[PDB]
Amino acid sequence: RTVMVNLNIHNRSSDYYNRSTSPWNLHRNEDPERYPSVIWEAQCRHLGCINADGNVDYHMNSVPIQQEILVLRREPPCPNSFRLEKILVSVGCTCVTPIV
Amino acid sequence: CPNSEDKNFPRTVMVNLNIHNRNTNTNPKRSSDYYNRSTSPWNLHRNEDPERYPSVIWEAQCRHLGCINADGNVDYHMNSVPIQQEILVLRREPPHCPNSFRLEKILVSVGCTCVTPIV
Amino acid sequence: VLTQPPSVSVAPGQTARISCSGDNLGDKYANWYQQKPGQAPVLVIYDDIDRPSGIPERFSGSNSGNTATLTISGTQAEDEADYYCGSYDFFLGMIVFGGGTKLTVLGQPKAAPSVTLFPPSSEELQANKATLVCLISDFYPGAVTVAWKADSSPVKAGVETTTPSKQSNNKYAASSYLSLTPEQWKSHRSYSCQVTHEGSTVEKTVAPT
Amino acid sequence: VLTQPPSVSVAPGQTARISCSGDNLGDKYANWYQQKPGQAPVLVIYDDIDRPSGIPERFSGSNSGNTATLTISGTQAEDEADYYCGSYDFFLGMIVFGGGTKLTVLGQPKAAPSVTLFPPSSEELQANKATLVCLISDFYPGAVTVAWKADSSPVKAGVETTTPSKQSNNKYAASSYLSLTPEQWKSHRSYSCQVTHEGSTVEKTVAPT
Amino acid sequence: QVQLLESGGGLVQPGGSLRLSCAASGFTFSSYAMSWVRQAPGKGLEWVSTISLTSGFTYYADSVKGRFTISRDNSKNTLYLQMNSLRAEDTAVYYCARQLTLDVWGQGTLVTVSSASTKGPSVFPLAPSGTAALGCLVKDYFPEPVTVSWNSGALTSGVHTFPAVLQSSGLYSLSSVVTVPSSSLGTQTYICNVNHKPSNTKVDKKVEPK
Amino acid sequence: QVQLLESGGGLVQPGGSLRLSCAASGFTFSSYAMSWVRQAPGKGLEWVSTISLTSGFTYYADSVKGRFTISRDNSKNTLYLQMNSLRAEDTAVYYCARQLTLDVWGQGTLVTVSSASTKGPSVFPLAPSSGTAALGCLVKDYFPEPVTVSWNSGALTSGVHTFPAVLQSSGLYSLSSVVTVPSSSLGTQTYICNVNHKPSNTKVDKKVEPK
Ligand SMILES: [Cl-]
């Protein structure tokens, strides 16, 4: 079954996505059955990277930085219950050199 | 006991601790070599806490202030910055406290990117 | 409970700020809606700071501490409306709204009411009824009093007057009805609808055919 | 409850795989420990895939579903040991181990046992006791049979023999003790410790003098 | 272009039932959560119910729980609100809206809970007399709303339809007036089109000089 | 260097009590979680207890809950394990270890719980016989483990083989330690084995000379 878990969320704006040489878009993901209810998934804008001159350079690549996060999901309609869940999310992108 | 918990609405929730793992890309931060190949390379640093889930967290620290150019040299016209994300963690309550677990958030560095001062 | 000021006033071209407060609002996302009279609400700000496409850049939002704030820079008369904050509470599984805030833009010119008075139609009289219709529009501010007269005698019986309502051009409208019998209508040489606004009076007069 | 295979065998230079499965193992890191005879365990893989400094690159870790796997590429004879998987469970507040896996590297050269036999000491004889000591070392594989002989007659009474114990060089050692009375020891021409290993016999003899 | 259009509003007796529908167009309906929000006349917004894009998950306000049922038919791009055991407090304009952010709204539809039967209005011309005012009187109807257009909606300039008066009888009356050039009184035909849907009243009234 | 040293292990009756200590050095002790892990002879690893770096959090296996108590003294860089109501199945080598990964281990300390009494060993010389010759020492009938043997107070290590003990049916242990030395030094070099059996406070130095 379940377990009582205390909420302590209440406790005691970056523009990197635009300024990065591997810039990315933020796709809003809304889910009423999930906590957080909204997640912004990073999507790399380019295959290459932006060089010092401000142009697309294909000698390098924009790749997503990903991690596994803990998430709450609302259980079937006994209701008022949740389940722990792990998902993979993209938080941003970085510029890497090809494996050569 | 965390007195802050009094100000949480609602105070408690019922949750199934049988974790549903939807991530098939296990160890997503340490399984790739992006941290080495990036123009804003970073090191992952380990943190261990028995009273926390996840018990082990690896956090990124940028190797350089600037970013590495094509010549392999650091360029200070741009910045290596850590990408921060707020994540959910569980923590174990002290023994004299009512329940066993509490839910809260922390800020972690996932990796680093290279940013230009003005676009 | 989300709490908003009932109303804020702002000088034209200046910055308007509307607040919205509640428990853990800073832990949640705030949304802002604009509703003009007779219209459906329109989303102007979502996820605390984000602005939908089509919404003017003078609209911005923030969520600091237990307070979300809608900010309008260079406020124009067209921005007069009710503003509502809203937020989704995941653990409650509910959407909560604030009570709403009426935004007033100052410095709007005084405007005398346009008054039109209709006599009972021949159709209504054939049905053995009679209604005097006094239509009042385009006045500012939105307060008015109406007095009726049979010939030159003050009358209140049969008089029913609406509240003032906000027009789309930010001015106000109202209407007054005098219900009477066809005989009463015939027993007088005329009727008058006198509308007083900010101390000044505008009257119209109609007579039997 | 973590489950490991009791035994795994591999050819020299080949790949060894040791699995570890259990419920909910996929939501927490697994560690791997190597333990050689008479030594404390040594961490070889932690956090599923990480190698401590000093561990050869041929050791690798992986995880799939609720199964963790230790992989040794180009397995060496020095890799022979017991391997344990381990993990910490936050919710139960416990560390759990697997049952362990003994890794055997095939094709290692056969080695005949070296045998040393000691007669009862003068001191022990003065104490009205008699013990013959038969020491057996550096044999492979780890199995021997020892037979004691009074002159040429087999004696079973008073014989205590150890099980072979693996050494650092992957070879084995053992010892056997024959308890006698001073009378029995002096009433025979000699006593022998006969060790048989893989069909070949190394036998030593001692006599009262 | 994203749109939400509602149907099904009108007059219902207390304890009675009524179903609202919301037709969605210009987007992939099944990809979004949908909601109902209501607003009593002169009051603020009140959330009623929400349905997820994921089947089985519905949410309700306490004041409505057990009485209203939200549902959706993705194959028809339609959101429903089944309202049973209706009370006087349920009287309001009901809006459908998309997503938890409520980023697009329907035009709204008025639900009136009352034990009184509907009454269609009487319609009278308000004859004119360089500008002239003419109109239509829409007398004694119940309940709201009434719409008035002129020349089938072709005439919109100078048109002013006033909010209704509520008399002691419990019936409503409103007027619509249009200001036109005086010279057009002999060159243009003016017809008001009155609709009172609750009573299926539809009147086209010609408004002539004198 | 990083190091963990266990002590306090020994023979104890069933129902008896015992306190183990683990002295840490070469690292900031207070910054790490610490654990006790035990292993019965020939058996697998069994986690006993863990203490967090954070005050107030201890963890136990079900089989020792209510009987064992883990604690730490950061000022002394020492980990403790108070063991009460000991059962025969508690008999094992007890290891001290650092972090949840158990990345560094001590050498362990043997805890024996039994109604049997301690027994000091008899030490007998194993005289050389007749290149190189073989001599040794016989340490006979002791209980319990362990027994340490050195030669010439640790000066002689080359060619020294101390065999694992035998467990006799009597319940007593016996082992031998043999040294292979050149026979030309048998008349010029003196050989003494140093046998030490702590549980019975038996310390014996035995000279091994040819007869
Ligand atoms: Cl004979």
Domains and CATH numbers, chain C: 1-107 (2.60.40.10), 108-208 (2.60.40.10)
Contact partners, residue D183, CB within 8 Å, separation at least 6: none
Query: How many Å lie between the alpha carbon of C106 and the closest alpha carbon of chain E?
Result: 23
Q: Do B30 and D47 touch (CB under 8 A)?
A: yes
Query: What's the structural domain count of chain B?
Result: 1
Contacting partners of chain E (3+ CB pairs under 8 A)? A, C
Find the D152 Cα to ligand 1 centroid distance in Å. 9
Q: How far is D107 from chain F (nearest CA, A)?
A: 25
End-to-end CA distance of chain D: 61
Instruction: Give D27 to chain B, closest Cα distance, Å.
Output: 7
Neighbours of C126 (CB within 10 A): 9
CA distance, residue E165 to nearest chain C CA (Å): 5
Distance CA F141, CA C90 (A): 73
Q: Which residue has the tokens 């019986």?
A: C157
C13 burial via Cβ count (<10 Å: 0-12, 13-18, 19+): exposed
CB-side neighbour CA atoms (13 Å) of E198 = 24
CA F119 and chain centroid, separation: 16
Domain annotation covers residue A80? yes
A32–E59 CB contact, under 8 Å: yes
> Which residue of C91, C94, C95 is the best one to mutate when testing the A interface, meaning the one whose CB has the most A CBs within 10 A?
C91
Nearest to A37 among C24, C49, C88 (CB): C88
DSSP annotation string for chain D: -BB--SEEEE-TTS-EEEEEE-TTGGGS--EEEEE-TTS--EEEEBTTTBPPTTS-TTEEEEEETTEEEEEETT--GGG-SEEEEEEEETTTTEEEEB--EEEEE--PPPBPPEEEEEPPPHHHHHTT-EEEEEEEEEEBSS--EEEEEETTEEE-TTEEEPPPEE-TTS-EEEEEEEEE-HHHHHHSS-EEEEEEETTEEEEEEE---
CB contact (8 A) between residue E162 and residue C46: no
Q: Do A35 and C93 touch (CB under 8 A)?
A: no
Q: Determine the residue among C133, C137, C165, C169 to mutate to test chain E binding: the one whose Cβ has the most chain E Cβ atoms within 10 Å.
A: C133
Given the DSSP bridges, would you call strands C81-89 and C94-97 parallel, antiparallel or unpaired? antiparallel
Q: What spacing in Å lies between the alpha carbon of A74 and ligand 1's midpoint?
A: 92
**Contact, A70 vs B53, CB < 8 A?**
yes
Q: Is C24 close to A10, i.e. CB distance below 8 A?
A: yes
Distance of CA D188 from the midpoint of ligand 1 (Å): 9
State the first-to-last Cα distance of chain C, in angstroms, to the nearest integer: 60
Alpha helices in chain A (DSSP H): 16-19
Torsion angle of the four alpha carbons C48, C50, C53, C54, in this order, in degrees rounded to the nearest 10: 50
User: What gap in Å lies between CA E150 and CA E67, rounded to an integer?
Assistant: 41
Tokens in use for D153? 């007659």
Documented resolution in Å: 2.2
Nearby residues of F93 by Cβ (< 8 Å), 6 or more positions away: F38, F39, F40, F41, F108, F109, F110, F111
Q: What SS3 string covers D77-92? A: HHHCCEEEEEEEECCC
Closest CA to C45 of C83, C2, C89, C74: C83
User: Reduced to 3 states, what is the DSSP secondary structure of residue C30?
Assistant: strand
Alpha helices in chain C (DSSP H): 122-126, 182-186
In a domain, A3, yes or no: no
| Structure obtained using | X-ray
**Distance (Å, rounded) from C-alpha E152 to C-alpha E103?**
32
- Domain with B96, as residue range(s), is 1-119
Coil, strand or helix at F26: coil
Per the document, the length of chain C is 209
Name the residue type at position E144: E
Name the DSSP class of C111: B
| Contact in structure between D8 and D102 (CB atoms under 8 Å) | yes
Instruction: Supply C20's token pair.
Output: 């919205």
CB contact under 8 A, C29 and A38: yes
Token code pair at residue D177: 């003790």
DSSP SS3 for C109: coil
Is A92 among the domain residues?
yes
Please indicate, yes or no, if residue A59 is contained in any of the structural domains.
yes
The dihedral of CA C182, C183, C189, C194: what is its sign?
negative
Give the helix ranges, DSSP H, for C34-167.
122-126
Residue E67, min C-alpha distance to chain C (Å): 17
Closest by Cα among B54, B55, B34 to B43: B34
The minimum CA-CA distance between F59 and chain D, rounded to whole Å, is 6
Residue (of F108, F115, F37, F31) closest to F77 by Cα position: F31
CA dist list (Å): B46 to A65, B34, F54: 18, 17, 17
Q: Does D43 lie at the interface with B, CB-CB under 8 angstroms? A: no
- Chain B residues near residue F50 by CB distance under 8 angstroms: 50
* Contact (Cβ atoms closer than 8 angstroms) between residue C6 and residue C55: no
Task: Kindly state the tokens that stand for A16.
Answer: 């990197």
Q: What ranges make up the beta strands (E) of chain E?
A: 3-7, 10-12, 18-25, 34-39, 46-51, 58-60, 68-73, 78-83, 92-98, 104-105, 109-113, 122-126, 131-141, 147-150, 159-161, 165-166, 172-181, 191-196, 201-206
Q: How far apart are CA F84 and CA B87, in angstroms?
A: 43
Which amino acid is present at B60? A
The CA distance from E75 to E29, in Å, is 9
Contact E126, E134 (CB under 8 A): yes
Nearest alpha-carbon partner for D97 in F48, F106, F45, F94: F45
- Amino acid sitting at position E140: D
CA dihedral C166, C170, C171, C176 (to 10 degrees): -20
Binning chain A into helix, strand and coil, the percentages to the nearest 5 are 5, 55, 40
Query: Dihedral of CA A80/A86/A89/A94: which sign?
Result: positive
Pairing of strands F45-51, F34-39: antiparallel
CB–CB contact B50 D63 (8 Å): no
- Alpha-carbon gap, residue C8 to C19, rounded angstroms: 10
Of B14, B24, B88, the CB nearest to A4: B14
CA distance, residue A28 to nearest chain B CA (Å): 15
- Residue-range domains of chain E with CATH: 1-115 (2.60.40.10), 116-210 (2.60.40.10)
Write the DSSP symbol of residue F194. Answer: E
Contacts of C125 (CB under 8 A, 6+ apart): C182, C185
CATH number at residue A43: 2.10.90.10
Closest in B33, B77, B113 to A93, CB measured = B113
DSSP summary character for residue A47:
S
Contact F187, F138 (CB under 8 A): no
The residues, any chain, with a CB within 8 Å of residue F185's CB and separated by 6 or more, are none
Q: Which positions ≥6 away from A55 have C-beta within 8 Å?
A: none
Give all strands (DSSP E) within chain F, no chain letters.
3-7, 11-12, 18-25, 34-39, 45-51, 58-60, 68-73, 78-83, 92-98, 104-105, 109-113, 122-126, 132-142, 148-151, 160-162, 166-167, 173-182, 192-197, 202-207
D151: CA distance to ligand 1 center in Å?
Answer: 8
Task: Say if D162 is an interface residue toward chain F (CB within 8 Å).
Answer: yes
Query: What residue of F is the nearest CA neighbor of B56?
Result: F100
Q: Which residues on neighbouring strands pair with residue C113, listed in sequence order?
A: none
CA–CA gap between residue F191 and residue F194 (Å, rounded): 10
Rounded CA-CA distance A43/A51 in Å is 19
A73 has which bridge partners?
Answer: A34, A83
> Which residue in E9, E34, E33, E25 sits closest to E94, CA to CA?
E9
| Cβ pair E95, E108 in contact under 8 A | yes
Nearest CA in chain B to C90: B10
Residue E42 CB-density burial (10 A; 0-12 exposed, 13-18 middle, 19+ buried): exposed
Interface contacts (A, E; CB < 8 Å): 21
Terminal-to-terminal C-alpha distance of chain F: 47
Q: Answer whether A10 sits within 8 Å of C29, measured CB to CB.
A: no
Q: d(Cα A68, Cα A31) in Å, to the nearest integer? A: 18
Q: Among all residues of chain B, which has the CA nearest to that of D93?
A: B50
HSE-up of residue E62 (Cα within 13 Å, Cβ side): 2
Nearest to B14 among A66, A82, A97 (CB): A82
Q: Do C97 and E44 touch (CB under 8 A)?
A: yes
Which one, of A61, A67, A46, A54, lies nearest residue B39 by Cα? A61
Buried-exposed string C25-49: b where 16+ CB fall within 10 A, e elsewhere: bbbbbbbbbbbbeeebbbbbbbbbe
SS3 F62: helix
**B95: helix, strand or coil:** coil
Q: Measured at the alpha carbon of residue C175, what is the angle toward residues E106 and C100, in degrees to the nearest 5? A: 40
Closest CA to F20 of F100, F99, F90: F90
Q: CB of D178 within 8 A of CB of D148?
A: yes
Sheet arrangement for strand C59-64: C16-21, C67-72, C59-64
Amino acid letter, residue B53: Y
